[PDB]
Amino acid sequence: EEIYYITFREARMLLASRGNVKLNLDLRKTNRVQEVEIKDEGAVFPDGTLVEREVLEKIARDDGTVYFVSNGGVYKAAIAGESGFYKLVPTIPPTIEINGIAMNPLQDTRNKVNTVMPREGETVLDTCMGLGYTAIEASKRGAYVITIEKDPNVIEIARINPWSRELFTGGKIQVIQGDAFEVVKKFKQASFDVIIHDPPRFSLAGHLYSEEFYRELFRILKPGGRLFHYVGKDLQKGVMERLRRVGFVGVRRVEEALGVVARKPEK
Ligand code: NA
Ligand code: NA
Ligand code: NA
Ligand code: NA
Ligand code: NA
Ligand code: NA
């Protein structure tokens, strides 16, 4: 029934600890710890499954993947599909690896969402899900979030990540699978109070930096609507330039969040 998430951190703990220990089994999502009694042949979890020393040693040495204990057995939070191999990586919080792809982390997503300050009663567009962390943070403020994910395997990996749970627990957030450049075309004009645009790097996602795309972002924003465009330069240049060309105003760097904000006029 319950899933116990375990990474190298927990396995090392259990191989080197004695008797019984209190450990966190949802990847620090909920701060709660549970007792796992240690035996010679392995560790038995709060469900009664014994993960044998063999398994814990294996995962104690593999610090590059998340594991979980579901029903009878232990499992690896990964998926083989199409031409890529995706896996959840035991960072805090977890990150996704697609064959091989990318206080620091969770503050960074709060800095991003802080640029546009989504409020209760507002609708936000998050153009590139990833694991959903920006979409979730924007929804925890009270806004209704639409978030686009191109890769159905990213969505499936998000599904077993306890940190992406709010993408799927009812509503507050709605997940569109598809191509963001094409999806935004089928959005109605003046739909969104804020847009958070966090695309892949220029060289791999040039069309998400195009005037054509920015015009679509412009069209679908409400008057007075807010845009954050991540940048992470010479492209910041064009981004700022192309956003004004398209209609945006208040276009400026936000240094903390490594991006550009903009505001659609005619409030
Ligand atoms: Na496996
Ligand atoms: Na507001
Ligand atoms: Na995003
Ligand atoms: Na995200
Ligand atoms: Na989040
Ligand atoms: Na796209």
From TrEMBL:
GO terms for molecular function: methyltransferase activity. One of its GO terms (biological process) is polyamine biosynthetic process. The keyword Transferase applies. Residues 124-225 form the Methyltransferase domain. The keyword Methyltransferase applies. Keywords: Methyltransferase, Polyamine biosynthesis, Transferase. Coiled coil: none annotated. InterPro entries: Methyltransf_25, SAM-dependent_MTases_sf. PANTHER family: BLR2883 PROTEIN, THERMOSPERMINE SYNTHASE ACAULIS5. This is SAM-dependent methyltransferase, UPF0020 family. It comes from Thermococcus kodakarensis (strain ATCC BAA-918 / JCM 12380 / KOD1) (Pyrococcus kodakaraensis (strain KOD1)).
